[PDB]
Amino acid sequence: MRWYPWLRPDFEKLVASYQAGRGHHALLIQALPGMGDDALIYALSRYLLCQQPQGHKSCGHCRGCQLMQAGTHPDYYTLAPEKGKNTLGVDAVREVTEKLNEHARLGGAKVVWVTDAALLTDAAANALLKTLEEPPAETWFFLATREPERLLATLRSRCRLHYLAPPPEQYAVTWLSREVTMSQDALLAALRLSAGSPGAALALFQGDNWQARETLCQALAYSVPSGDWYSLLAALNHEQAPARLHWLATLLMDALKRVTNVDVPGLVAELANHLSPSRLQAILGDVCHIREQLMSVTGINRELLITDLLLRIEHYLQPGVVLP
Amino acid sequence: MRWYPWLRPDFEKLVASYQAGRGHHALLIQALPGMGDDALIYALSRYLLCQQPQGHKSCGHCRGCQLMQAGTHPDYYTLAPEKGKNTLGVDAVREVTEKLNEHARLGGAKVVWVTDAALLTDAAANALLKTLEEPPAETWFFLATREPERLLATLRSRCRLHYLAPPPEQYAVTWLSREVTMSQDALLAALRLSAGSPGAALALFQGDNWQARETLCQALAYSVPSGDWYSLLAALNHEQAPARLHWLATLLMDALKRVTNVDVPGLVAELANHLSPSRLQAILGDVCHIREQLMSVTGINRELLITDLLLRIEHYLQPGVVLP
Ligand SMILES: [Zn+2]
Ligand SMILES: [Zn+2]
C-alpha cells in the first residue's frame, strides 16, 4: 500500500463530504489496479474510525487509531476472497453483516471494505445488497472494482460511484522517471499498456514483466516474417498469460492504426507491413477473445487455448481463407 | 505494532536529540516485551527517513514516506532472526553492513533496526561492533533488548542506552481497564507478573494465557495439601513453559513474603501456611534454575527437565532432607 501523490484531489473531495454529512454509506470506487484505491479507501477508513480527527487526518494517538495501527479494531471489517479461493463466498459476507447489526464496540462508526466487489459470489453480492438497502447506523462501506460492469447490477445502483481517474500522462511519466531509470518512451509505453495507471506501469518494470515483454517482442520479430505463430507459445504460456496477450493485442492494434507501444515502432511497422489489415483484425479479435476466456474461467488447460489460438492465427494468414 | 500513549515522553526526548544533532548513531533501547520499543524505534525511523519532516512527525507524503508505507525504502534495514532460526547469523548482518558502505539510494539518511541484539550470534555481534566503531555517514542504528546483560559486552559500550521505563502502575491499570473488562486485582496481578509492561499484561488476557494460569492455580491448590507436585506436569508442559514457571516462581516468592499475585491471596496463603520458608526457597531456586535452562537451550527434551524438577521438589518436602 502506498500513498501516491495523485490521490489528494480525490481524497480531499471525498473526505470533506463525509465530514459535512454529504457522504454515501456505499462508496463504489472504480480504479485500474495500481492507481491506489486501496490507500484511498484506507485513508478514508482511518479518518472515520479516528475518535479525534485533526481536520481530515487521523490523529494516530487515540485508541481507535491504536487498534487500527495494531490491526485489531473491532469496528473495521475487510472482505477479501479467502486466500484459499478466487471468489468471495456468502458465509464470509453474512458473517460480517450479522456483526454489523450490533452496536459498534468502540461506540462510533463502523467501516466495511470490500476489496473487489467483482469477486463477490452471486449470493454474496445479493446478501450485501440487502444490507446496503437498509444500511445499519453509522456504517460506511467501501467497495472497489476495476470494471463495475462485472458486478451484480442491482449492487451498482445502490452505491455512489467515484471513478479514481489516472493523473495526466505527462505527470505520470515524470513520477515514473523518479521511480526507475529508463528511456522515457519505455515509461510512456508501460504507462499506456497500463491504461494510465502509474502504479501498474511501475509493476511492469519490477521483475519478470519487462523482460517477458521483450522476449515476446523478440518472438514476434521471428513469427511475422516466418508465418510461424505457434512458436510464440513459450513467451505466452505462463501464469500471467492474460497480460501477455494484452501486450500482443496492443501491438496488433497499433499496427492497425496505419499508439501504445511507443518504444518499439520497429515491430509495429513490421506488423503493419507484413500483415494485411483484415488479418491484423482477425488475429486481434481472436487474441482478445482468448484473453477473456483465460480470465473468466482460465480454461483448466490454458496451454490448449493458447496453442489453438496460435494455430487459428496461422490459418488466417493463408490466401483464400474466410476470416470471420 | 501499536503506538501506546506512554511512549510520548521518550519519543519527544529522543527525537529532539536527533533533530538538534545530539543523537547517537547507536541507540540501544532497553525494554520489556509489550512496552512498545518497536513502535518507538519505528516512529524514530520514520522521522529520520522523512525527506520533509513536519516538526517531529513524518509527513506521510514525500517519496521516502511513500516507500516506507510500501515497505520498499532501500535505505531502511531490518535485522531479525531469519524465520527459520532463533538466532541472528553473521551473513545477514554483513549483508546489510556491506550495503551500508554505499551512498544512500535516496541520498539522505540510512536506518538499521536490530530487533533483538541478544539474538545476535557471537560473530554477528562482533561484526556489528566493527561497523559501530566506524559508523558509516548518516546511518542511524537502533538495537533493542529485554536484558542488555545478555549482549556481547563490547557491543553495549558503543551504544547509548535508553531504558524505556514502564509508566506508573496506576496509569497502566487504568489503560488496561479500557482494553479489557476484568476485576482490577487481576489487572494489577497481570501487570505485576509482566513487570509493569502494560502491553505484555494485555497479552495474558488474550487467549490461552489467563486460563492457563488459572489451571496452574487450580493444580497448585491440589499439590500443596497433597504433596503431589509431579501432577503439575500437564499445566506446565507446553511451549510457553518458561512463562508458566515464572507464574509459579512468583507465587512461591509471594508466599515467602510472610505482592505480585494480588488476585489470589488464598493460594498464596495456602502456600505460606503448608510450606516452610526453607522449602519455599529451595523450590523457588530450582524453579528459577529450570526456567533458565528451558530458555537458554530449551533442553531438547523439556518434559524431562520439568518432571525432574517436580520430583526434586517432592524430595524437598521430606523430613530430614538437606535442601542445598
Ligand atoms: Zn485517532
Ligand atoms: Zn515524509
Q: Is B66 on the interface with A (CB under 8 A)?
A: yes
- Locus of grid cell 537451550: B297
The grid coordinates listed for A46 are 482511518
- Residues from chain A that touch B65, judged by Cβ atoms under 8 A, are 3
The grid coordinates listed for B199 are 502491553
Query: What are the C-alpha distances in Å from B282 to residues B248, B275, B286, B298?
Result: 13, 11, 6, 22
The grid coordinates listed for B105 are 539510494
* Contacts with B, A 155-214, CB within 8 Å: 178
Q: Which helix (H) or strand (E) holds B293?
A: helix B277-297
Q: Is B65 on the interface with A (CB under 8 A)?
A: yes
Nearest to A46 by CA among A34, A35, A37, A59: A59
Query: What are the C-alpha distances in Å from B315 to residues B244, B254, B322?
Result: 22, 22, 10
- Gap positions in chain A, given as the residue before each gap (C–N > 2.5 A)? 258
Of residues B2, B60, B67, nearest to A70 (C-beta) = B2
Helices A8-19, A37-48: inter-axial angle, 10-degree rounding: 30
User: Are A66 and B178 inside 8 Å of each other by CB?
Assistant: no
SS3 B103: coil
Q: Which helix (H) or strand (E) holds B303?
A: helix B302-316
- A266 Cα to the center of ligand 2, angstroms: 42
Query: What are the C-alpha distances in Å from B122 to residues A95, B30, B91, B93, B109?
Result: 50, 20, 12, 12, 28
The grid coordinates listed for B307 are 518432571
What topology does CATH give the domain B208-323? Zinc Finger, Delta Prime; domain 3 (1.20.272)
Nearest to A168 by CA among A196, A202, A194, A146: A196
- Residues from chain B that touch A1, judged by Cβ atoms under 8 A, are 69-70
Q: Is A65 on the interface with B (CB under 8 A)?
A: yes
Query: What are the C-alpha distances in Å from A193 to residues A168, A190, A204, A278?
Result: 15, 5, 9, 23
Whole-angstrom Cα distance, residue B196 to residue B173? 9
Specify the length of chain A in residues: 324
- C-beta of residue A270 within 8 angstroms of C-beta of residue A224: yes
Domain B168-207 and domain B208-323 have a common topology: no
CA-based nearest distance A243→chain B, Å = 24
Q: Which helix (H) or strand (E) holds B126?
A: helix B122-132
Whole-angstrom Cα distance, residue B236 to residue B246? 10
* Chain A residue with minimum CA distance to B176: A63
User: Are B66 and A3 inside 8 Å of each other by CB?
Assistant: yes
What topology does CATH give the domain A168-207? Helicase, Ruva Protein; domain 3 (1.10.8)
- C-beta of residue B233 within 8 angstroms of C-beta of residue B306: yes
The grid coordinates listed for A307 are 496453442
User: Are A69 and B4 inside 8 Å of each other by CB?
Assistant: no
State this model's resolution in angstroms: 2.2
* Chain A residue with minimum CA distance to B68: A2
Q: Is A60 on the interface with B (CB under 8 A)?
A: yes
- C-beta of residue A9 within 8 angstroms of C-beta of residue A171: no
Query: What are the C-alpha distances in Å from A170 to residues A31, A77, B67?
Result: 19, 37, 22
Phi and psi angles of residue A46, each rounded to the nearest 5 degrees, phi first: -60, -40
Q: How is chain A split into domains, by residue range?
A: 1-167, 168-207, 208-323
Whole-angstrom Cα distance, residue A142 to residue B130? 51
β pairing state of B110-114 and A139-145: unpaired
Residue B166 CB coordination number (10 Å): 22
Convert chain A into a string of H (helix), E (strand) and C (coil).
Answer: CCCCHHHHHHHHHHHHHHHCCCCCCEEEEECCCCCCHHHHHHHHHHHHCCCCCECCECCCCCHHHHHHHHCCCCCEEEECCCCCCCCECHHHHHHHHHHCCCCCCCCCCEEEEECCHHHECHHHHHHHHHHHCCCCCCEEEEEEECCHHHCCHHHHCCCEEEECCCCCHHHHHHHHHHHCCCCHHHHHHHHHHCCCCHHHHHHHHCCHHHHHHHHHHHHHHHHHHHCCCHHHHHHHCCCCHHHHHHHHHHHHHHHCCCCCCCCCHHHHHHHHHHCCHHHHHHHHHHHHHHHHHHHHHCCCCHHHHHHHHHHHHHHHCCCCCCCC
User: Are B69 and A178 inside 8 Å of each other by CB?
Assistant: no
Whole-angstrom Cα distance, residue A289 to residue B302? 62
In one letter, which amino acid is A278? Answer: S
Whole-angstrom Cα distance, residue A114 to residue A109? 17
User: Are A61 and B4 inside 8 Å of each other by CB?
Assistant: no
Whole-angstrom Cα distance, residue A191 to residue A188? 5
Of residues A3, A65, A69, nearest to B1 (C-beta) = A69
- Residues from chain A that touch B5, judged by Cβ atoms under 8 A, are 61, 66
Residue A204 CB coordination number (10 Å): 23
User: Are B3 and A178 inside 8 Å of each other by CB?
Assistant: no
* Strands, sheet with B139-145, edge to edge from the N-terminal-most edge strand: B76-79, B110-114, B139-145, B26-30, B160-163
Task: Give the angle B41-B46-B51 at the CA atoms, nearest 5°.
Answer: 150
**Ligand at shortest distance from the CA of A58:** 1
Query: What are the C-alpha distances in Å from B223 to residues A74, A223, B35, B233, B235?
Result: 41, 83, 35, 11, 12
- Chain A to chain B Cβ contacts (< 8 Å): 32
The grid coordinates listed for A74 are 473491532
Q: Is A3 on the interface with B (CB under 8 A)?
A: yes
Of residues A2, A66, A70, nearest to B69 (C-beta) = A2
- A71 Cα to the center of ligand 1, angstroms: 14
Homologous superfamily, domain A1-167: P-loop containing nucleotide triphosphate hydrolases (3.40.50.300)
